Coordinates of all heavy atoms in Angstrom, one line a residue:
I1 N 0.9 -1.2 0.0 CA 0.0 0.0 0.0 C 0.9 1.2 0.0 O 1.6 1.5 1.0 CB -1.0 0.0 1.2 CG1 -1.9 -1.2 1.1 CG2 -1.7 1.3 1.3 CD1 -2.8 -1.2 -0.1
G2 N 0.8 2.0 -1.1 CA 1.7 3.2 -1.2 C 2.3 3.4 -2.6 O 2.5 4.5 -3.0
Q3 N 2.5 2.3 -3.3 CA 3.1 2.3 -4.6 C 2.1 1.5 -5.6 O 1.7 0.4 -5.3 CB 4.5 1.6 -4.6 CG 5.5 2.4 -3.8 CD 5.6 2.0 -2.4 OE1 5.0 1.0 -2.0 NE2 6.4 2.6 -1.6
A4 N 1.8 2.2 -6.7 CA 1.0 1.6 -7.8 C 1.8 1.6 -9.1 O 2.9 2.0 -9.1 CB -0.3 2.3 -7.9
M5 N 1.1 1.2 -10.1 CA 1.7 1.1 -11.5 C 0.6 1.2 -12.5 O -0.5 0.6 -12.3 CB 2.5 -0.2 -11.6 CG 3.6 -0.1 -12.8 SD 4.4 -1.6 -13.0 CE 3.1 -2.7 -13.6
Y6 N 0.9 1.9 -13.6 CA 0.0 2.0 -14.7 C 0.6 1.5 -16.0 O 1.6 2.1 -16.5 CB -0.4 3.5 -14.9 CG -1.4 3.7 -16.1 CD1 -2.7 3.3 -16.1 CD2 -0.9 4.3 -17.3 CE1 -3.5 3.5 -17.2 CE2 -1.7 4.5 -18.4 CZ -3.0 4.1 -18.3 OH -3.8 4.4 -19.4
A7 N 0.2 0.3 -16.4 CA 0.8 -0.3 -17.6 C 0.4 0.4 -18.9 O -0.8 0.8 -19.0 CB 0.4 -1.8 -17.6
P8 N 1.3 0.6 -19.8 CA 0.9 1.2 -21.1 C 0.2 0.3 -22.0 O 0.3 -1.0 -21.8 CB 2.3 1.6 -21.7 CG 3.2 0.6 -21.1 CD 2.7 0.3 -19.8
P9 N -0.7 0.7 -22.9 CA -1.4 -0.2 -23.8 C -0.5 -0.8 -24.8 O 0.4 -0.1 -25.4 CB -2.5 0.7 -24.4 CG -2.5 2.0 -23.6 CD -1.1 2.1 -23.0
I10 N -0.6 -2.1 -25.1 CA 0.2 -2.8 -26.0 C -0.6 -2.8 -27.4 O -1.7 -3.3 -27.4 CB 0.5 -4.2 -25.5 CG1 1.2 -4.1 -24.2 CG2 1.4 -4.9 -26.5 CD1 2.5 -3.4 -24.2
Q11 N 0.1 -2.4 -28.4 CA -0.5 -2.3 -29.8 C -0.3 -3.7 -30.5 O 0.8 -4.1 -30.6 CB 0.1 -1.2 -30.6 CG -0.5 -1.1 -32.0 CD 0.0 0.1 -32.7 OE1 0.9 0.9 -32.2 NE2 -0.5 0.4 -33.9
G12 N -1.4 -4.3 -30.8 CA -1.3 -5.6 -31.6 C -2.1 -6.7 -30.8 O -2.8 -6.4 -29.9
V13 N -2.0 -7.9 -31.4 CA -2.7 -9.1 -30.8 C -1.7 -9.8 -29.9 O -0.6 -10.1 -30.3 CB -3.2 -10.0 -32.0 CG1 -3.9 -11.2 -31.4 CG2 -4.2 -9.2 -32.9
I14 N -2.2 -10.1 -28.7 CA -1.3 -10.8 -27.7 C -1.8 -12.2 -27.6 O -2.9 -12.5 -27.1 CB -1.4 -10.0 -26.4 CG1 -0.8 -8.6 -26.5 CG2 -0.6 -10.8 -25.3 CD1 -0.9 -7.8 -25.2
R15 N -1.0 -13.1 -28.0 CA -1.2 -14.6 -27.8 C 0.0 -15.2 -27.3 O 1.1 -15.1 -27.9 CB -1.6 -15.2 -29.2 CG -1.5 -16.7 -29.2 CD -1.6 -17.2 -30.6 NE -1.2 -18.6 -30.7 CZ -2.0 -19.7 -30.6 NH1 -3.3 -19.4 -30.4 NH2 -1.6 -20.9 -30.7
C16 N -0.1 -16.0 -26.2 CA 1.0 -16.6 -25.5 C 0.6 -18.0 -25.2 O -0.6 -18.4 -25.1 CB 1.5 -15.8 -24.3 SG 0.3 -15.9 -22.9
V17 N 1.6 -18.8 -24.9 CA 1.5 -20.2 -24.4 C 2.3 -20.4 -23.1 O 3.3 -19.8 -22.9 CB 1.9 -21.2 -25.5 CG1 0.9 -21.2 -26.7 CG2 3.3 -20.9 -26.0
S18 N 1.8 -21.3 -22.3 CA 2.4 -21.6 -21.0 C 2.3 -23.0 -20.6 O 1.5 -23.8 -21.2 CB 1.7 -20.7 -19.9 OG 1.5 -19.4 -20.3
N19 N 3.1 -23.4 -19.7 CA 3.1 -24.8 -19.2 C 2.8 -24.8 -17.7 O 3.5 -24.1 -16.9 CB 4.5 -25.5 -19.4 CG 4.7 -26.0 -20.8 OD1 3.8 -25.9 -21.6 ND2 5.8 -26.6 -21.0
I20 N 1.7 -25.4 -17.3 CA 1.3 -25.5 -15.9 C 2.0 -26.7 -15.3 O 1.6 -27.8 -15.6 CB -0.2 -25.6 -15.7 CG1 -0.9 -24.4 -16.3 CG2 -0.6 -25.8 -14.3 CD1 -2.4 -24.7 -16.8
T21 N 3.0 -26.4 -14.5 CA 3.8 -27.5 -13.9 C 3.8 -27.4 -12.4 O 4.7 -27.6 -11.7 CB 5.3 -27.4 -14.3 OG1 6.0 -26.3 -13.6 CG2 5.4 -27.1 -15.8
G22 N 2.6 -27.1 -11.8 CA 2.4 -27.1 -10.4 C 1.1 -26.5 -10.0 O 0.3 -26.0 -10.8
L23 N 0.8 -26.6 -8.7 CA -0.5 -26.1 -8.2 C -0.3 -25.8 -6.7 O 0.6 -26.3 -6.0 CB -1.6 -27.2 -8.3 CG -2.6 -27.1 -9.4 CD1 -3.6 -28.2 -9.4 CD2 -3.3 -25.7 -9.3
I24 N -1.1 -24.8 -6.2 CA -1.2 -24.4 -4.8 C -2.6 -24.6 -4.3 O -3.5 -23.9 -4.8 CB -0.7 -22.9 -4.7 CG1 0.7 -22.7 -5.2 CG2 -0.8 -22.5 -3.2 CD1 1.2 -21.3 -5.1
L25 N -2.7 -25.5 -3.4 CA -4.1 -25.9 -2.9 C -4.1 -25.8 -1.4 O -3.1 -26.3 -0.7 CB -4.5 -27.3 -3.4 CG -4.5 -27.6 -4.9 CD1 -4.9 -29.0 -5.2 CD2 -5.5 -26.6 -5.5
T26 N -5.2 -25.3 -0.8 CA -5.4 -25.3 0.6 C -6.7 -26.1 0.9 O -7.4 -26.5 0.0 CB -5.6 -23.8 1.1 OG1 -6.8 -23.3 0.7 CG2 -4.4 -22.9 0.6
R27 N -7.0 -26.3 2.2 CA -8.2 -27.0 2.6 C -8.8 -26.3 3.8 O -8.1 -25.5 4.5 CB -7.8 -28.5 2.9 CG -7.0 -28.7 4.2 CD -6.7 -30.2 4.3 NE -6.1 -30.4 5.7 CZ -6.8 -30.9 6.7 NH1 -8.1 -31.1 6.6 NH2 -6.2 -31.1 7.9
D28 N -10.0 -26.6 4.0 CA -10.8 -26.1 5.2 C -11.2 -27.2 6.1 O -11.3 -28.4 5.8 CB -12.1 -25.4 4.7 CG -12.8 -26.2 3.6 OD1 -12.3 -27.2 3.1 OD2 -13.9 -25.8 3.3
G29 N -11.3 -26.8 7.4 CA -11.6 -27.8 8.4 C -13.1 -28.0 8.6 O -13.9 -27.0 8.9
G30 N -13.6 -29.2 8.6 CA -15.0 -29.5 8.8 C -15.3 -29.9 10.2 O -14.8 -29.2 11.1
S31 N -16.1 -30.9 10.4 CA -16.5 -31.3 11.7 C -15.8 -32.6 12.2 O -16.0 -33.0 13.3 CB -18.0 -31.6 11.8 OG -18.4 -32.4 12.9
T32 N -15.0 -33.2 11.3 CA -14.2 -34.4 11.5 C -15.1 -35.6 11.9 O -14.8 -36.2 12.9 CB -13.0 -34.2 12.5 OG1 -12.5 -32.8 12.4 CG2 -11.9 -35.1 12.3
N33 N -16.1 -35.8 11.1 CA -17.0 -36.9 11.4 C -17.2 -37.7 10.1 O -17.5 -38.9 10.1 CB -18.3 -36.5 11.9 CG -19.0 -35.4 11.1 OD1 -18.5 -34.9 10.1 ND2 -20.3 -35.1 11.4
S34 N -17.1 -37.0 8.9 CA -17.3 -37.7 7.6 C -16.0 -38.1 7.0 O -14.9 -37.9 7.6 CB -18.1 -36.7 6.7 OG -18.1 -37.2 5.4
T35 N -16.0 -38.6 5.8 CA -14.8 -39.0 5.1 C -14.7 -38.3 3.8 O -14.4 -38.8 2.7 CB -14.9 -40.5 4.8 OG1 -16.0 -40.9 4.0 CG2 -14.9 -41.3 6.1
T36 N -14.9 -37.0 3.8 CA -14.8 -36.1 2.7 C -13.8 -35.0 2.9 O -13.5 -34.7 4.1 CB -16.2 -35.5 2.2 OG1 -16.0 -34.9 1.0 CG2 -16.7 -34.5 3.3
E37 N -13.3 -34.4 1.8 CA -12.3 -33.3 1.9 C -12.7 -32.3 0.8 O -13.2 -32.7 -0.2 CB -10.9 -33.8 1.8 CG -10.3 -34.5 3.0 CD -10.1 -33.6 4.2 OE1 -9.8 -32.4 3.9 OE2 -10.2 -34.0 5.3
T38 N -12.3 -31.0 1.1 CA -12.6 -30.0 0.1 C -11.3 -29.2 -0.1 O -10.7 -28.6 0.9 CB -13.7 -29.0 0.6 OG1 -14.7 -29.8 1.2 CG2 -14.2 -28.1 -0.5
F39 N -10.7 -29.2 -1.3 CA -9.5 -28.5 -1.6 C -9.8 -27.4 -2.6 O -10.5 -27.5 -3.6 CB -8.5 -29.5 -2.3 CG -8.0 -30.5 -1.4 CD1 -8.5 -31.8 -1.3 CD2 -6.9 -30.2 -0.6 CE1 -8.0 -32.7 -0.4 CE2 -6.4 -31.2 0.3 CZ -6.9 -32.4 0.4
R40 N -9.3 -26.2 -2.2 CA -9.5 -25.0 -3.0 C -8.2 -24.3 -3.4 O -7.2 -24.4 -2.6 CB -10.4 -24.0 -2.1 CG -11.7 -24.5 -1.7 CD -12.4 -23.4 -0.8 NE -13.7 -23.9 -0.4 CZ -14.9 -23.8 -1.0 NH1 -14.9 -23.1 -2.2 NH2 -16.0 -24.3 -0.5
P41 N -8.2 -23.7 -4.6 CA -6.9 -23.0 -5.0 C -6.8 -21.7 -4.2 O -7.7 -21.0 -4.0 CB -7.1 -22.8 -6.5 CG -8.6 -22.8 -6.7 CD -9.2 -23.7 -5.6
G42 N -5.5 -21.4 -3.9 CA -5.2 -20.2 -3.1 C -3.9 -19.6 -3.5 O -3.4 -19.8 -4.6
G43 N -3.3 -18.8 -2.6 CA -2.1 -18.1 -2.9 C -2.0 -16.7 -2.3 O -2.5 -16.4 -1.2
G44 N -1.4 -15.8 -3.0 CA -1.3 -14.4 -2.6 C 0.1 -14.1 -2.1 O 0.6 -13.0 -2.3
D45 N 0.7 -15.0 -1.4 CA 2.1 -14.9 -0.9 C 3.1 -15.3 -2.0 O 3.0 -16.5 -2.5 CB 2.3 -15.6 0.4 CG 3.5 -15.2 1.1 OD1 3.7 -14.0 1.4 OD2 4.4 -16.1 1.5
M46 N 4.1 -14.5 -2.3 CA 5.0 -14.8 -3.3 C 6.2 -15.7 -2.9 O 7.0 -16.1 -3.7 CB 5.6 -13.5 -3.9 CG 4.5 -12.6 -4.5 SD 3.6 -13.4 -5.8 CE 2.4 -12.1 -6.2

C-alpha cells in the first residue's frame, strides 16, 4: 500500500502459451465426522 503502477497499452494481438507445472491448494476444516475433503486453490504470498 503506497506504490502503484499504470501499464501502457500494447498495440497488436497478444497470444502466448504456458506450461502449468504445479499447483497451490489449501483445505478447510470440517466437523471431523465424515470421510470427505474440500480442496480450494489459493495463494497471494510470493
Side-chain angles (χ1 to χ4, degrees):
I1 296 299
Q3 294 92 5
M5 200 184 65
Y6 177 74
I10 305 299
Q11 181 176 4
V13 178
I14 297 179
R15 164 193 167 92
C16 68
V17 290
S18 315
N19 279 3
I20 299 154
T21 78
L23 259 182
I24 299 177
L25 301 179
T26 75
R27 70 184 191 96
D28 45 351
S31 159
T32 325
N33 56 352
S34 171
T35 60
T36 188
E37 286 290 329
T38 316
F39 291 96
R40 300 177 182 270
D45 194 54
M46 299 303 173

